[PDB]
Amino acid sequence: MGRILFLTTFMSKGNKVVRYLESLHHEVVICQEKVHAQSANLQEIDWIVSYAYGYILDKEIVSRFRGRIINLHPSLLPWNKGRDPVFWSVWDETPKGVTIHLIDEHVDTGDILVQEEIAFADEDTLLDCYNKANQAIEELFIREWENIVHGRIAPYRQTAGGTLHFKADRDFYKNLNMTTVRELLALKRLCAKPIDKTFHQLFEQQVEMTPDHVAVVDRGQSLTYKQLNERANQLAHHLRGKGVKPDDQVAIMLDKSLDMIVSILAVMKAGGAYVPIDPDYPGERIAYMLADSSAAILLTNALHEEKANGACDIIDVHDPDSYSENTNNLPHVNRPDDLVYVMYTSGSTGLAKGVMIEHHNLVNFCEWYRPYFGVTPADKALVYSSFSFDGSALDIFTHLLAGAALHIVPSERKYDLDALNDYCNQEGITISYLPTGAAEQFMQMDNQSFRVVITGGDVLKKIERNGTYKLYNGYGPTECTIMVTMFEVDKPYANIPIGKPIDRTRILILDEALALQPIGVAGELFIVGEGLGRGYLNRPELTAEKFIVHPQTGERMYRTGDRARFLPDGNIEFLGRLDNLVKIRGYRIEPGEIEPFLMNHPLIELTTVLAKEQADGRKYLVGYYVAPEEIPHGELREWLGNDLPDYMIPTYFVHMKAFPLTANGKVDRRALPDVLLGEDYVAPTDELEQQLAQVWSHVLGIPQMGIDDHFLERGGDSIKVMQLIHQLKNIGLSLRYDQLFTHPTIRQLKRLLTEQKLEPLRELDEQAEYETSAVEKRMYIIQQQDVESIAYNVVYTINFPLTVDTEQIRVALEQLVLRHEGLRSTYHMRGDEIVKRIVPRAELSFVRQTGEEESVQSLLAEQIKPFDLAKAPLLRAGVIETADKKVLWFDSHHILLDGLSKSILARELQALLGQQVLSPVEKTYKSFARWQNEWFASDEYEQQIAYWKTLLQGELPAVQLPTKKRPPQLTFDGAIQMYRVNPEITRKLKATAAKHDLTLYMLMLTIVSIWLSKMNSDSNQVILGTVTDGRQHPDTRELLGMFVNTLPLLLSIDHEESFLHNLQQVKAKLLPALQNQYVPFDKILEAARVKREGNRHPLFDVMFMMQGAPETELESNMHHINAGISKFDLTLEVLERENGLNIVFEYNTHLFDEGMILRMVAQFEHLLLQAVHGLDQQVKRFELVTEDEKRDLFLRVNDTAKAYPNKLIMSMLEDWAAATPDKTALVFREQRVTYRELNERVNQLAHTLREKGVQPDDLVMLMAERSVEMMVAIFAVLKAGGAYLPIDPHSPAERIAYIFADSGAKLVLAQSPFVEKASMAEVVLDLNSASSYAADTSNPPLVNQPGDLVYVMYTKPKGVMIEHGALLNVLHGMQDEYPLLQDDAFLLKTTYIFDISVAEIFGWVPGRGKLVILEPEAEKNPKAIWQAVVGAGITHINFVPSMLIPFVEYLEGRTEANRLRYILACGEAMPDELVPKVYEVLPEVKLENIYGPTEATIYASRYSLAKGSQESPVPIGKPLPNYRMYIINRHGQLQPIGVPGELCIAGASLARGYLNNPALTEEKFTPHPLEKGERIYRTGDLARYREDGNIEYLGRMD
Ligand SMILES: *P(=O)(O)OCC(C)(C)[C@@H](O)C(=O)NCCC(=O)NCCS
């Protein structure tokens, strides 16, 4: 009975087998972790039985246990060896069974001991099969174990054959194991000839089949196939004679006509592809297509010739010399992979993209179209669609190859469908493609000619039609040629499916991971096959992103962005777009976020606002609302206009009695009804306004710009304003950057430009060395000042799947090396000139490492090493391969790769990784460097630097942040915390900025400015740096290099004005800066009389960077790796990522603790949320501290609630003389008064007072210097009922008369000499004389309450009224922290015209301790005070930094003070040195720093100073029991940790106020909302909390 090692997948697997072995008394060891030769689970083992073990055993282990190592493999070996055996046995449909075998050297190949067949039912899921096989093999082992142990079985070698599978082979099928075996194999079937001819080859082939058949009809005129072919051949010979070659583009700008079809075919036959340009398009679209398309030839009319503005070499289709005599077919020069046409996508996501479609793409469609629709020459097709839409390639090309006749739609009849149907019935139009919009509308017509009406492009919903024609619903974007699927609408559907794939077309429904979705499961519609176009014109990055090579399958597929599912019958259901978001008039917004604003309308009950796209793709918003009666259109537009920008205002509003609902109660959005320029849209009037309207549409990628539309409300960024200025100078108009914002409409711009009064970047000739740009010089300077610094290393990481070939990544980067001079640029110092050298070729470091996900970052950090700017390439890369990922990392230098350069690098790396080619870089950085160097000598520069001189000449504001002690020199060690604005808030921000003619940058800038303002004591002027793109010359947009310029922003936050007003002022202050942005930061420093000095950065310590969303997917998946670097104190880098804002707080680790950034991070969020919701609120009303910070601040600082006895201080004196009469209570030199002796003396003096009308609040006055008489006077003034008002006998008489007159005191107790000094005293009971002492010694009745005054302390001085209970709170507070027990004693050092004496004078009676009345002679004398400490064994002593300094000067050499417990310093800020110096002079003693204003009853905060701790700023500490302390700014709101503010005390210990000075009392004791309406005392003292909560005194607010 031997031990047995059970190796299985998880612990409970094969547990039946384990239990059986144990019943045979086999000790079994279950192990799922990887076992090695040296594993402790191997010795004393007789058998090893593995069972789907997740690892392979070392060949040492297998040989050691020869004949004694069995594996339970759930497959009919040799079939399905290795991983996922059951699944592959089902997918590959290989023989099924379970096999117990001898593990041998290879994977699942040894001699079988016991094998058994198994069967899976069609209805079983792949999990069921997996389970059934696992159960069958376990039972098999249980039955034949005995035969195996005893060796009765004869092992037999596996049959020859089988299969093998690894972990990754199933990734493509991961989502399928919950499908039935039937369903699985059904998907297997669902996912299981070449094209030789070009179109004109087939057309010419068709011309020879039906030459005299009508080919094209245009009103009265018409051409036959022969005539069309010949006329096109004539133009083709002329076009080919003009240089047209394969893949060349020939623009065609004509109306639908015969010349149109002739020109189209003429371009093909010539060899090239025709770029169609509908002349009805606006000039903006018409100039764009001519420029973007590489077309030199423009086939056009004289009617439309001027619409090209001489941009193209025109070949007039009416000039007879444009047609050759030769009418024959030209020699074929085209392959099926050559371009046939270039269509431009919609202008929704911006400017259209040239879709490059190859011949085989069109031929495959036409070769499928003809037989699918049974097209014959008898058919007559309508040339209905604008020639620019591929819907017209359908119209023209599919029907020409079928011999059908084309019928140009009359311009008049195109949109008057009544006349269209008439024409269709007249001419007999049998087949045609109509866009869904026009199709549904045409169904209403009484058509009788059509047999097949194909539709698509938009969601078809209507099936009913007054015609006998088969309605066909087709789908497929322009990228995959007209349509990739076709459905025969045989019946109505809630979702009319788009059909099955067309010829040579496979369609995969894939999830985000590109893995197969089970049939019926929705996913992204991926198109594979012959329809896939070549890609986008001049957009290789977009081609690589949309035309992907599947990682598992290897097939090239197109990513449609559409959601669809396969229905059980094979047809595909179109489920709209994947993205919840939609781009409306230039903004990606969530239409459901407009719903609350509509529903907020009084008349509106429900609302469900969807996004609908016009026929031409223009997206508009429809706001459906359930209201009793229809609401006036203009009333809703104005309603939303009060809160939303134009683009969030639905173009149309639809009233409905109620919404259609789904089975789940949701609004059935599909069941909502369907429905232009917009109100206040003024079309251009003058020829100038038209030009201005064209440049606008181009810059903003949005058409139809009204002359009152605001630029920043139509998607205008600052980058786009630059494009406008650049493209206006091209148009001949000179516009200034700030002029665009002051004239943000074309009406305003037309008046601005009444002159109409070029300058490309001059590429330099080759030199050994070139000028560097100003910023190139700066980057170089920075790096050479710390050659070992990785501070400007630009490190990024991309997580690639294991399927990626690392060598492809390596090779792509090397191309980027050979493509951009920046990556071959080396910077050198030739004398005093920073100089760049261009290397022709550079070798890229590309390292490969294998590790684990746990060590990727560690392996990468070691790779981030400094760059030698004299060595190219300034870029390193590598791949860290883990079990899951191949992590691509690359590191570049900032002198080469700024944010935009990186976008260009990501852009182009994506193209190369996606097997695309890049156009050669037209310009070089060095050319811009020289241009800008010469521009620095122009008048424009002198005017720009003049702005900076005038702006930065005066005193500049400084922005102090709640940081740690600055390093003596600038450090760059840092870390990042990232705050995520969610997409919802981010759209709210963009909507706010657009609503009020602002950019998102201005908005975020004003939020950061307010944030910095609030953290800078709500300063009016804030200064912070920002980064401009620094791409001054428009010819530098595409160059890798350091362009970005740093700008200082002098912004003025007016906290009394609203947030918007602040936005306009910041805008007003920013635009001049951005107008003069091209002065190098270093030259702005010169003009500002500022130089790089010290531990602070020159003009600003906070950088605010902002870069828009990534331009490409690869850039999106690029993870900026911060190598522990912070270029400034703090950098807020708002990054548009995943429709939100990744606000990365890059901070100096020496200036901020992770907790200090976590708080500032939380504060910024809280503030950003307060701005977005407080557009019209005064900025002063925005809170900086978060509610969680207030709670923790209370918990850590103000959780001081400790119930205390309300029994009065003299009642407490009474009890002690009654319980322990004879104990020592006072000690003045030889006097050692007891509790009974003191109390009675007090009772005598008390009666005297009551006999002279001393009610509560009555103010008695004292001027008796340190003597028992003082205690008698106090303790008994208190007993009498009135308050004691101390006065100094040594003060001038003008003040004693002032204090007495202003106090209105009723009587005066003064030590015998000081009665004459109390001149003209109303009723003067000589303190010392016995006459002032009644013989009665009975404890008078305590009529005083805790609310009546106990003493009046004077500060023209002011008298602080403080009530009794306020004092008890303190005395019990100090007693808890610093108990003055019977053994203890208190020294009296501080003069009693100071709130500190009150502690001495009463801080002894709580614990029945004694009070040493130190003599006035020994007041400032520390040696004399030193005697008391040793003499009477003082335990409590109050002190001040001024007296505790000399007291310390008598150092350890003086000893004999064992009883001394506490030293309580107060009144002044304690120096740092005064703490440790004390400790060496007096160990075993507790030192305490105390703070308390006279208005807060003696004390307020305390800080215990540990012996083993040294404080840099000795804090005044946390508040006492029932004390609450608040640090507020000049607007009355709580400050966060570190931020200076006015210290305020609250609680039961606040002084009643100033005596008969109410204007002053209400000034300083203000009912604050932070104390639940109760008043706070404003101290006039600047302070700031610490991380732990201890308050730090900063000084009076002066
Ligand atoms: P506008 O108010 O929309 O924005 C102004 C702007 C300074 C942000 C803009 O003109 C600009 O230059 N953005 C470029 C930001 C950048 O280049 N970041 C690079 C970081 S290395």
Tell me which residue has tokens 């920075």. 782
Q: What are phi and psi of 327, to 5 degrees?
A: -110, 0
User: Can you read off the two tokens belonging to residue 835?
Assistant: 């100089």
Q: What is the 3-state secondary structure (H, E, C) of 47-105?
A: EEEEECCCCCCCHHHHHHCCCCEEEEECCCCCCCEECCHHHHHHHCCCCCEEEEEECCC
- Compute the distance from residue 1212 Cα to the ligand 1 centre, in Å: 71
Residue of 892, 1001, 1040 to test ligand 1 pocket, by largest number of atoms within 8 Å of CB: 1001
Q: What are phi and psi of 925, to 5 degrees?
A: -60, -45
Burial of 1182 (0-12, 13-18, 19+ CB in 10 A): buried
DSSP state, residue 471: E
Contact 98, 108 (CB under 8 A): no
Q: By alpha-carbon position, which residue is closest to atom 1 of ligand 1?
A: 718
Contact 1105, 1027 (CB under 8 A): yes
Closest CA to 1352 of 1339, 1343, 1361, 1363: 1361
Tell me which residue has tokens 């027990």. 1381
What type of residue is 1239? Answer: N
Q: Which atom of ligand 1 is nearest to the CA of 1043?
A: 17
Q: What is the 3-state secondary structure (H, E, C) of 800-869?
A: EECCCCHHHHHHHHHHHHHHCHHHHEEEEEECCEEEEEECCCCCCEEEEEECCHHHHHHHHHCCCCCCCC
Q: CB under 8 Å to 815, separation ≥6 — which residues?
A: 912
Burial annotation 741-765 (CB, 10 A radius, 16+ → b, else e): bebbbbbbbbebbeeeeeeebeebe
Burial annotation 1511-1521 (CB, 10 A radius, 16+ → b, else e): bebbbbbbbbb
- Compute the distance from residue 1108 Cα to the ligand 1 centre, in Å: 8
What type of residue is 610? Answer: L
E strand spans, 948-996 = 974-981
Closest CA to 476 of 449, 499, 443, 447: 499
Q: Pick left, alpha or beta for residue 728 (phi over 0 → left; psi -120 to 50 → alpha; otherwise beta).
A: alpha
User: CA-CA distances (angstroms) from residue 809 to 513, 574, 889, 890, 1540?
Assistant: 20, 36, 10, 11, 53
Burial annotation 448-479 (CB, 10 A radius, 16+ → b, else e): ebbbbbbbbbbbbbbeebebebbbbbbbbbbb
- Compute the distance from residue 1562 Cα to the ligand 1 centre, in Å: 50
- Compute the distance from residue 344 Cα to the ligand 1 centre, in Å: 30
Give the Cα separation of 426 and 801 in Å (integer). 61
Q: Which atom of ligand 1 is nearest to the CA of 1026?
A: 7
User: Can you read off the two tokens belonging to residue 1061?
Assistant: 């007003």
Q: By alpha-carbon position, which residue is closest to atom 7 of ligand 1?
A: 1028
Q: CB under 8 Å to 1342, separation ≥6 — which residues?
A: 1208, 1210, 1211, 1279
Q: Which residues pair with 850 in a beta bridge?
A: 881
Quickly count: other Cβ atoms within 10 Å of residue 1234's Cβ. Answer: 17
Contact 878, 887 (CB under 8 A): no
- Compute the distance from residue 776 Cα to the ligand 1 centre, in Å: 18
Q: By alpha-carbon position, which residue is closest to atom 6 of ligand 1?
A: 1028
Q: What are phi and psi of 932, to 5 degrees?
A: -65, -35
Residue of 793, 902, 999, 1027 to test ligand 1 pocket, by largest number of atoms within 8 Å of CB: 1027
The stretches of 681-802 forming alpha helices (DSSP H) are 687-700, 718-731, 737-742, 746-752, 774-784
Q: Which atom of ligand 1 is nearest to the CA of 1044?
A: 17
Give kind and range of the element (H or E) at residue 798.
Answer: strand 793-801
Closest CA to 1490 of 1511, 1473, 1505, 1478: 1505
User: Can you read off the two tokens belonging to residue 1560?
Assistant: 């002053």
Q: Which residues pair with 624 in a beta bridge?
A: 654
The stretches of 317-385 forming alpha helices (DSSP H) are 359-373
Strand 1283-1286 and strand 1307-1310: the pairing is unpaired
Quickly count: other Cβ atoms within 10 Å of residue 570's Cβ. Answer: 14
Give the Cα separation of 706 and 151 in Å (integer). 93
**Nearest 10 degrees: CA dihedral of 1045, 1048, 1049, 1050?**
-160
Contact 1554, 1566 (CB under 8 A): no
Give the Cα separation of 1545 and 1496 in Å (integer). 7
Contact 1386, 1404 (CB under 8 A): yes
Residue of 901, 1004, 1028 to test ligand 1 pocket, by largest number of atoms within 8 Å of CB: 1028
Give the Cα separation of 701 and 586 in Å (integer). 7
Give the Cα separation of 526 and 528 in Å (integer). 7
DSSP state, residue 897: B
User: Can you read off the two tokens belonging to residue 143?
Assistant: 């039955």
Q: What are phi and psi of 806, to 5 degrees?
A: -65, -30
Burial annotation 366-401 (CB, 10 A radius, 16+ → b, else e): bbbbbebbebebebbbbbbbbbbbbbbbbbbbbbbb
Helix 774-784 with 925-935: angle, nearest 10 deg? 110
User: CA-CA distances (angstroms) from residue 1088 to 773, 776, 1066?
Assistant: 21, 21, 20
What type of residue is 569? Answer: D
Q: What are phi and psi of 1047, to 5 degrees?
A: -120, 140
Tell me which residue has tokens 């017509």. 445
- Compute the distance from residue 939 Cα to the ligand 1 centre, in Å: 25
Q: CB under 8 Å to 1410, separation ≥6 — which residues?
A: 1224, 1225, 1226, 1227, 1384, 1385, 1386, 1404, 1432
Q: CB under 8 Å to 467, separation ≥6 — which residues?
A: 443, 445, 447, 448, 450, 453
Give the Cα separation of 511 and 1031 in Å (integer). 40
Helix 1000-1015 with 1154-1172: angle, nearest 10 deg? 120
- Compute the distance from residue 305 Cα to the ligand 1 centre, in Å: 40
Q: Which atom of ligand 1 is nearest to the CA of 1002?
A: 2
Give kind and range of the element (H or E) at residue 1580.
Answer: strand 1575-1585
Quickly count: other Cβ atoms within 10 Å of residue 585's Cβ. Answer: 26
Q: What are phi and psi of 967, to 5 degrees?
A: -60, 145
Give the Cα separation of 440 and 414 in Å (integer). 15
Closest CA to 1464 of 1508, 1411, 1410, 1399: 1399
E strand spans, 107-170 = 112-117, 164-165
- Compute the distance from residue 1107 Cα to the ligand 1 centre, in Å: 6
The stretches of 1251-1324 forming alpha helices (DSSP H) are 1268-1280, 1293-1303
Give the Cα separation of 11 and 26 in Å (integer). 18
Q: CB under 8 Å to 710, separation ≥6 — which residues?
A: 744, 745, 997
- Compute the distance from residue 1106 Cα to the ligand 1 centre, in Å: 6
Q: Which atom of ligand 1 is nearest to the CA of 720?
A: 3
Q: Which residues pair with 564 in a beta bridge?
A: 523, 574
Distance, C-alpha 336 to centroid of its chain: 47
Q: Which residues pair with 1529 in a beta bridge?
A: none
Strand 875-881 and strand 845-850: the pairing is parallel
- Compute the distance from residue 1105 Cα to the ligand 1 centre, in Å: 7
DSSP state, residue 931: H
User: CA-CA distances (angstroms) from residue 102 to 15, 22, 166, 543?
Assistant: 20, 21, 21, 53
Q: Which atom of ligand 1 is nearest to the CA of 998?
A: 2
Q: Strands across the sheet with 1462-1465, in order?
A: 1226-1227, 1410-1412, 1385-1387, 1436-1439, 1462-1465, 1486-1491, 1501-1505, 1518-1519
Q: What is the 3-state secondary structure (H, E, C) of 1433-1451?
A: CCCEEEECHHHHHHHHHCC
Quickly count: other Cβ atoms within 10 Å of residue 767's Cβ. Answer: 12
Q: Pick left, alpha or beta for residue 1522 (phi over 0 → left; psi -120 to 50 → alpha; otherwise beta).
A: left
User: Can you read off the two tokens belonging to residue 1183?
Assistant: 């809170």
The stretches of 853-982 forming alpha helices (DSSP H) are 856-861, 899-913, 925-935, 939-952
Q: Which atom of ligand 1 is nearest to the CA of 902?
A: 21
Distance, C-alpha 1190 to centroid of its chain: 25
Give the Cα separation of 396 and 404 in Å (integer). 9
Q: By alpha-carbon position, which residue is closest to atom 10 of ligand 1?
A: 718
Residue of 700, 710, 711, 718 to test ligand 1 pocket, by largest number of atoms within 8 Å of CB: 718
Give the Cα separation of 188 and 176 in Å (integer). 10
Rg (the chain; Cα; Å)? 45
Closest CA to 356 of 215, 231, 537: 537
Q: Pick left, alpha or beta for residue 14 (phi over 0 → left; psi -120 to 50 → alpha; otherwise beta).
A: left
Tell me which residue has tokens 């070698």. 157
Q: Which atom of ligand 1 is nearest to the CA of 719?
A: 10
- Compute the distance from residue 81 Cα to the ligand 1 centre, in Å: 58
Give the Cα separation of 1167 and 1014 in Å (integer). 10
**Nearest 10 degrees: CA dihedral of 1051, 1054, 1057, 1058?**
40
Which 3 state secondary structure label does DSSP give 460?
A: coil
User: DSSP string spanning 242-256?
Assistant: TT--TT-EEEEE--S
What type of residue is 39? Answer: S
E strand spans, 231-346 = 249-253, 273-276, 295-300, 313-316, 339-344
Whether the ω angle into residue 1110 lies within 30 degrees of 0, i.e. cis, is: no
Tell me which residue has tokens 């503010």. 1541
**Ligand 1 binding site (Cβ under 6 Å of any ligand atom):** 717-719, 898-900, 999, 1001-1002, 1026-1029, 1044, 1105-1107
- Compute the distance from residue 1007 Cα to the ligand 1 centre, in Å: 16
What type of residue is 1086? Answer: E
Q: CB under 8 Å to 708, separation ≥6 — which residues?
A: 680, 681, 682, 745, 746, 747
User: DSSP string spanning 1151-1187?
Assistant: T--HHHHHHHHHHHHHHHHHHHS-TTSBGGG---S-H
- Compute the distance from residue 862 Cα to the ligand 1 centre, in Å: 32
Helix 1000-1015 with 1059-1075: angle, nearest 10 deg? 110
Q: By alpha-carbon position, which residue is closest to atom 12 of ligand 1?
A: 1028
Strand 339-344 and strand 431-433: the pairing is unpaired
Q: Which residues pair with 1363 in a beta bridge?
A: 1349
Determine the number of helices (DSSP H) and then strands (DSSP E) in the chain: 44, 69
Contact 1428, 1418 (CB under 8 A): yes
Give the Cα separation of 1010 and 1164 in Å (integer). 10
Distance, C-alpha 1418 to centroid of its chain: 67
User: CA-CA distances (angstroms) from residue 1319 to 186, 328, 1260, 1266, 1316?
Assistant: 114, 133, 15, 21, 6
Which 3 state secondary structure label does DSSP give 939?
A: helix
User: Can you read off the two tokens belonging to residue 702?
Assistant: 């949005």
Give the Cα separation of 890 and 823 in Å (integer). 13
Q: Which atom of ligand 1 is nearest to the CA of 1106?
A: 15
DSSP state, residue 1230: T
Give the Cα separation of 1318 and 1287 in Å (integer). 10
- Compute the distance from residue 950 Cα to the ligand 1 centre, in Å: 24
Q: By alpha-carbon position, which residue is closest to atom 19 of ligand 1?
A: 899
User: CA-CA distances (angstroms) from residue 294 to 60, 305, 310, 356, 730?
Assistant: 67, 18, 15, 12, 19
Give the Cα separation of 260 and 254 in Å (integer). 6
Give the Cα separation of 1297 and 434 in Å (integer). 104
Q: CB under 8 Å to 1153, separation ≥6 — which residues?
A: 964, 1587
E strand spans, 158-248 = 164-165, 214-218, 221-224
- Compute the distance from residue 737 Cα to the ligand 1 centre, in Å: 14
E strand spans, 1321-1446 = 1324-1326, 1349-1354, 1359-1363, 1385-1387, 1410-1412, 1436-1439
**Nearest 10 degrees: CA dihedral of 368, 364, 265, 217?**
10
Give the Cα separation of 1410 and 1430 in Å (integer). 15
Largest distance between two CA atoms of the chain: 145
Closest CA to 1044 of 1028, 1056, 1057, 1061: 1028
Closest CA to 365 of 509, 498, 474, 273: 474
- Compute the distance from residue 1130 Cα to the ligand 1 centre, in Å: 18
User: Can you read off the two tokens belonging to residue 1593?
Assistant: 């005194």
DSSP state, residue 1336: -
CA geometry: angle at 372 spanning 366 and 378, to 5°?
Answer: 80
User: Rounded to a whole number, what is the distance in angstroms from the first to the last CA of the chain?
Assistant: 91
Give the Cα separation of 1270 and 1093 in Å (integer). 60
Whether the ω angle into residue 1034 lies within 30 degrees of 0, i.e. cis, is: no
Which 3 state secondary structure label does DSSP give 985?
A: helix
Quickly count: other Cβ atoms within 10 Å of residue 512's Cβ. Answer: 8
